[PDB]
């Protein structure tokens, strides 16, 4: 308190000579970050994203935060990679219920679905976001035979972890653009496909399409999704 409020580090050096044992102790101690935050201007395109920086959307500010300074994140936890996301894309038909939420976004359209099986980064990006934040709702739409996606965050306070983004950009690179934006107080990540490159894998469209048709859409899901579909249509136009 009283010493702490008064001493500058230019005065501690003659003191650390007498006590070199306490220097390391002093150095390690200073680990509570105060800086590493900055505002972000919407719509926030992810080419503007600063490397190794989480995003924090909240009533207390839409701001990017450095990973060392980030306290909402959890040091112990391991988030998947774009490669894990690809493996998940490959094994879709084994995890239909897990990924129920992703399939609802197609709104029972088999054309939009067939496009997804030619465009892995769509599933990948969903998979990657979902692992970070389970409370998201994707909506799929197509233009010129290219699948695009909008991912709505259900909650108003949204924290996008740093490594979740790094992986996103890996799955999205060159062909896609990603933009974060708020609409009607909700966060919406927009993934735009510029070009459909060749996929070197082939997902069994039939067993996927047929198994998706069989699923029932719950009324909680239906009514919640019903609310959100409008929100996107208002941001588009």
């Amino acid at each position: 308190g009283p010493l702490g409020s008064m001493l500058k580090l230019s005065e501690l050096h003659d003191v650390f000579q007498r006590h070199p044992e306490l220097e390391l102790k002093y150095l390690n101690m200073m680990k509570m970050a105060i800086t590493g935050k900055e505002s972000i201007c919407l719509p926030f395109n992810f080419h503007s994203h600063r490397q190794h920086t989480c995003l924090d959307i909240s009533p207390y500010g839409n701001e990017q935060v450095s990973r060392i300074a980030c306290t909402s994140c959890e040091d112990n936890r391991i988030l998947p990679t774009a490669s894990d996301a690809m493996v998940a894309f490959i094994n879709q038909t084994s995890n239909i219920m897990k990924n129920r939420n992703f399939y609802y976004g197609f709104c029972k359209s088999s054309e939009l679905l067939k496009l997804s099986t030619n465009q892995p980064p769509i599933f990948q990006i969903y998979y990657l976001l979902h692992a970070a934040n389970h409370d998201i709702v994707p909506f799929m739409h197509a233009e010129d035979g290219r699948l695009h996606m909008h991912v709505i965050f259900e909650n108003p306070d949204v924290h996008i972890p740093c490594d979740c983004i790094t992986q996103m950009l890996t799955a999205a690179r060159e062909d896609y653009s990603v933009t974060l934006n708020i609409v009607r107080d909700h966060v919406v990540i927009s993934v735009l496909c510029h070009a459909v490159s060749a996929s070197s894998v082939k997902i069994d469209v039939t067993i996927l399409q047929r198994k998706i048709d069989e699923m029932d859409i719950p009324n909680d899901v239906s009514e919640s999704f019903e609310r959100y579909k409008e929100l996107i249509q208002e941001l588009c136009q």
């Binding site: 308190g1 702490g4 580090l9 050096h13 306490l22 200073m30 509570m32 970050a33 800086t35």
Partner: protein
């Protein structure tokens, strides 16, 4: 002067916690002749937190000179080159360090105590440290300067008390 030269080198190894192979020393005789030569160049690991301010301030403590360090990107890693007094001329694309910096192989980033003052909010319980990160691109690195307060202010004050027995 040799003792002083050594003192600075030994400190740099301690504060940055560098092994013997990780610090490059140039000899004082060859430094004495030319003012524009670094006294030591420190090899910095990525994702490692480094106490740059305390190192600068130690150097200002021992010297009667405003120290000048410079981050150089060697291509595959960043090194921190340490000067007692700012060189007369430097590698052209040289600028001063902020909270975030994008460092190209071409470019070089100067760090002094006065750039740190600007970054840190208060002066009394705040120490700033730096971190190097591998960029999205292959050749590029990021230098992050971030200010830090203590875990516990009680422990800190205790420490400050223990320092004056």
């Amino acid at each position: 002067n040799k003792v002083l030269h050594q003192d600075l080198v030994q400190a740099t190894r301690r504060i940055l916690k560098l092994g013997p192979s990780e610090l490059r020393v140039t000899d004082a005789g060859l430094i004495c002749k030319n003012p524009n030569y670094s006294v030591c160049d420190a090899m910095l690991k990525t994702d490692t937190v480094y106490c740059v301010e305390y190192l600068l301030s130690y150097w200002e403590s021992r010297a009667d000179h405003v120290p000048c360090f410079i981050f150089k990107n060697t291509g595959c890693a960043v090194s921190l080159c340490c000067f007692v007094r700012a060189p007369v001329a430097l590698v052209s694309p040289a600028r001063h360090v902020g909270e975030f910096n994008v460092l190209k192989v071409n470019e070089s980033l100067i760090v002094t105590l006065k750039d740190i003052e600007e970054i840190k909010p208060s002066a009394y319980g705040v120490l700033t440290k730096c971190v190097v990160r591998k960029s999205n691109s292959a050749s590029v690195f990021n230098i992050e300067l971030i200010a830090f307060g203590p875990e516990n202010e009680g422990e800190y004050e205790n420490l400050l008390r223990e320092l004056y027995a």
